[PDB]
Design a protein that fits this description.
The structure is cut from a larger assembly and holds 17 copies of chain A. By secondary structure, the first copy, chain A, is an all-beta fold. Chain A has one domain: Sandwich (Immunoglobulin-like). Chain A has no helices and 10 strands. In chain A, the strands form 3 sheets. The first copy, chain A, has a 4-stranded antiparallel β-sheet, with no helix packed on it. A 3-stranded antiparallel β-sheet of chain A has the order 3-4-5, with no helix packed on it. In chain A, strands 9-10 form a two-stranded antiparallel sheet. Chains N and O meet through strand 2 and strand 5 of N and strand 5 of O. It is classed as chaperone.
Chain lengths: 135, 135, 97, 97, 135, 97, 135, 97, 97, 135, 135, 97, 97, 97, 135, 135, 97
């Protein structure tokens, strides 16, 4: 197993290809009585390059990427936005990126509540340590 | 400048000393009309060892540490708890640990609101990447 | 990676995700810029896509003869022959014994 | 880091902290100097801010055509095309199948 | 944790950016009955580059920084001044720079006095050794 | 780090943060355990402090003669002489010329 | 010149010698109309080992040193105290240790005043950076 | 550095700075402790001097026969012969041809 | 990793996923075996879980005195003191000045 | 980012812990009109250790793992079974394990058909090469 | 035995030779009452370069290969297609490439059924792990 | 591998699998392209074969004199003499003693 | 690889291909030999299969107590406990809180 | 260290300790010499201070245009532009959006 | 502590600066009934470069220093002179340079006499060995 | 020329020989109208081991040397004394040890005076730098 | 360097500079000390000479039989035979053919 690398490793191949920008996905927005899922394919972006913001019920996903070729460059951007329903519990909203490079913004509705928040402890600028689940 | 190390580096000195457990601090809880600050000296603990939780308005800070000596050990624990006032905006609560090792839990009251939340992007288990402020 | 033979200068980019009228190609001397902008309202808000690709063509290239063409497949290809060589297709007759 | 293509010489500095009329840009042959001075009385006294940025432009640059522009965002950008190349924007028409 | 470096390490990025000069901060001057705090963001300056002086009740903070690029340079300066109130105990004034790079000049008022001064022992030119607090 | 001379086995721990009646010292053969528990209600809730220190004393130590003493300064010291040596303080007279 | 070392380097020779403790010096206390000098020979102590304190007009110099031999140790202590005259300006008191290892506490009387204080900037625990004089 | 011959165990310390009646020598089995304390009022306050020197004598040493002596020069010397050897000075007669 | 002091032999395994009556602990001389079996019908079929943990206790351990206990938390702990040492908890009295 | 390793790397920690066996998951079986999903947490098992079989409409997931300690061992097994509904297209059933170690058996119902099967090309014993999707 | 290499190793010899494209083979299609065999000589292609698809009863084998010489290239392609008989069990179709480089697509007819399918477990993109037969 | 003597430029490819009328040879300046396409219906469907071989002939080669010939054996050979040398076969007479 | 604990000596071989009455197990002191022979006429002739497996058991093994057993699955297992240890299965009772 | 740009040659020395009329600056072709002499009677005798600083200016420097200036601060600065470049200060106008 | 070097080490910085020549010092000449001190800051000169002479009661301090730059040089000189009072004991005059680089010429008056002279033993040209004080 | 070493190098040979102690020399004391010479053979002693003192007109030369053999030692001492005549100029007395190891104490009488004293500049403890004569 | 054969222990020191009655030889168990002191008034004052030589003789040496002898040449030699060997001179007769 040689390909044990970050998901963005193979983005150097795509200097000329511009379909890698977050494409529309199968069942992108999942709206059940339990939660409000948003799944995006951000595989062309480092986590360091992405921005996730929440202004009221408006959720914004943003991303920017620049490479330098010998004498030119290759810029790539996106700006996805979602207005969350009124019944969604804004406090418990939680964003994750798995090793495949698929972002998934999980925000449960007010009814089905977990009651406790695992507050992320911010360390240095742009870094935080979360509670790892244990058995 | 030789002592450019993590704040918990010198905790190996304190195997027998048990005053290093979060002591009561000068102006520990600061309750203004703007925010609700909680400042703790967690310098004896790695960020990986601490837990910060929020069940309703009840905020809990927890910590555990184990060392192995040649034939024995040295355990150290704490459990600090604070019930936040009703007027505090639970959504915007934000915990930080500076390089000195002083935890500070900042939660602004409902009135003075920032309006936007910088959502931490969770990467791997127990890790997240936050938006770094830029000029 | 770009096709830079002594004969010609060719560049193939996939732009299938973008519609033809959304793309802009500009030339500032030996500097080639290809831009793209998408903007469609989603069910719950909106979606945006942007890119900017820049090339610096060598001094050998004859800038007057630049052609930009997007095919049925969606991919855009930019070609321009260098000053000196004649871009002429010539079929060679095949002889047998 | 400065933009030094064979085409042009561009320099982007953020000066948002300083007001436009407080800034001074000077040229002494191939030497470019950008100065800034702030002076506002604080509640308890005063505050001062100062900077001096100096560049040595290569001999290729055409010094007669230097433009210094500060945008809405507050950042100042200085650009000057080199002697030899024509600073002309040219939109290329996009053709389909 | 890769970014375990001095606070001024990332100032090489800012050759062209001139907002890094001590900006006005939230609650810069704190004037209570206990003390007289002054907090500045000197993160763009080495401690070696700063000067803190006291002429009577007039407190002056100064700073200078020079870099050399290939063929040019990038100078940066500031001069902050504060006139301390008459009731402030000038003897006990104490300046510190934390690992984040935030200077904080603490000078308690005459009433609330500590009674003892921890005199800094000057070693070589521009260096001193202070008493480290112990439990 | 513990005092382990051929003469005696001594251990000094600071426990000033804990009150004497809150501490527990136990012995399970050659295993020494020192525990501490604090519990005071804060203004806004409560505060807890806990520690457990464990030592494995070598077989040389005479376990019958163990003394645990907390002084005015708050620090606890545990000492126990090894089997073989007589714990006797003896003042030597000083002679001159 | 081989002996280019700290002044305390040769203290390992003195394991058994106990005259090295600050001896009474020629013209130890110098009391002029200008200043109030105190000169001590602390050559047996690292600057890190010394403490200089000021409680009112009472000035205290303290020092402690421990070595470990194969099976024993060698402790050395001192506690010097001086009550400064009422006419001495307590604010401008200044302690230095030269490369020879001679401490000298200089405190000028109220009349002959320098007017400006070069405030030492404290960096990390027990360290500070002073203004170096320049021509 | 201590004199540890198979014959005897000798220790020489300078204590000239301290007066004889200020010094204390103690023995706790094979552990030798030498303490010193000075306390004189200065013109402007007071001066203190303190030291503690500790030795661990090997099991060969005969502890019953320990002598501590401070000479005119001020230096204290502690000697104790090991169990086995007879501490006897014997002058050898010198013969010629 | 197992607790193997000269005093005792202790083993802590989490078995919270398994119910107490589903577990089997066997001893074959110095060989300790801990087995577990789960069997619950799912909505669409069935689910099975199995484990087998084996330890070889050293010859020092006194096999007659083995105790296996599962607490409220669900974790099982097996302890057995070695032949030679007396498993007796002894609280030491704390003295002050 | 140090923890760029296979998902089963940390299973050596769990020699004594037996909760790591596939636990019941949130929304394990998802039965929509489109597909029939089965999601399992097989993170304690190498892909080489698992078996997935289909006898008629009966789907079986199996797994076995053995470690050797100094003088003992640690065995772990499971056998999950699911009877797929009659309307599920048995031909297009597709099993995947992501880098997190979550198995997901996807089998679409007869109606919503993809029409083409990407047949896996078997190379050596127990290895196959699938068609990688391209833009 | 030096020639212990992949079957495609010697394809670098054939830059100019274009007979290596899957040639017609002896008894290419074998149609018995038991199975429906298709045997092809794909020795000029890496398994990574081939595609095997099934749209209904239509089976398609595809392949592409590109080399770069100093200043030119050598492309090679094929597209073989077979329409499988109605009586063939489409579920149990199974493609293999032996170490000689001969592809063989085995698909048994409905009557003679194995009853169990050894489902290939997909690992990373374009990779899968199959059950290895054991005695 | 291609025959590139100072005398001539020769290229031998086997194309026996393809029929002569199915092949295409093109020249675009110094770029030589050889394409092939086969298409025969199988018993159960169809079979396709395709290839594209491209060469970049050096500037020495005289492009006017290019000959492409496929022999009885099926292999195609492309030869073209370089500008400067005369392609003339000359039989040398053999003399004896 | 053979099971050689201090407790016992166990050997597991698969012999499923051979029928039980075709196998022979012999012991020559500390030397264990397992032989197999198959002989069935094929359609066109005959087929033969043969194997010989030999082990040298250590001197610890008690040779009197050797058991050879072939299960339903076809695999043969040979076990023999070493001299010193008692082969006794003992179920340990499981206690809860 | 001296300022040696392609534009000019500049040298800054501090001479604050010396009075202006005590200093001497000489030029011998491309050789620049700066001398200083102080002479004041002390209370008990006299004090002298002397220095000599020498520079070798490169052949690029235009020697006719050398200016030596001592400011209020006491420091002397010697500047001379090289032959080829025009020493002209030019203020660039600042434009906004 | 990196700056453990000779006092003249940093004189290479001062190629252009000419204030480093012995400046007038605070309390340069100290004339008590005990001794006759002369303190000079010779920190810009190696001890090898200085000359101290005594012609009758006339004491002369001299110094010279030359550096070579790429194509030029930097010379520096001084000549300090002092006429010692008639009551000074010329025999016991003693010059020292501490590690800071401060020369101090100590010559006691006839009354307060030490009685013994520690005669310096001259070794090789320009070198001598003095009696080191011992406790 | 191999024997280019210090004069005391060969003293390790003389562990048992005790004639090497300064022997009486030919014309040891030379008393002319010009000077008062004293010549001693101190070849058995390092310059570091010798002491030369002057109490009034009494001149004392002293020396001590200790070696350590495997289990024993070899001590060697001397104490030479000379009372200088009244007419000798005590100020100009000058001691030297040549490379052969012969000490020579030269002190000229009052009449024949050199007028200038080359004052030895003391550097570190027990070291001094003298003026080297130049042509 | 000392003569330490299995036969005897011999030590030769030159003491010619010292007179016989000025020397002192002492024995403290296995420790041998040789001291010397000279004191003659010079013409202008006095001269002193001192030495102390110490040896540690091995346990093999028989201390009862120690002889110290200073010859005509002035050199002192100390010899003592080890316990076990007989110090006897034996002349061997020389035989011829």
């Amino acid at each position: 197993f040689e390909d044990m690398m970050p998901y963005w490793a193979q983005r150097h191949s795509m200097l000329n290809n511009f379909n890698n920008i977050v494409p529309q996905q199968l069942n992108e927005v999942e709206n059940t009585a339990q939660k409000f899922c948003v799944k995006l394919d951000v595989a062309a972006f480092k986590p360091e390059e992405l921005k996730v913001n929440l202004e009221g019920h408006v959720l914004t996903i943003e991303g920017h990427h620049e490479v330098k070729t010998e004498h030119g460059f290759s810029k790539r951007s996106f700006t996805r936005q979602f207005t969350l329903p009124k019944d969604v519990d804004l406090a418990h909203i939680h964003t994750v990126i798995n090793k495949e490079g698929q972002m998934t913004i999980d925000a449960p509705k007010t009814g089905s509540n977990t009651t406790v928040r695992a507050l992320p402890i911010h360390t240095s600028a742009g870094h935080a340590v979360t509670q790892k689940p244990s058995s």
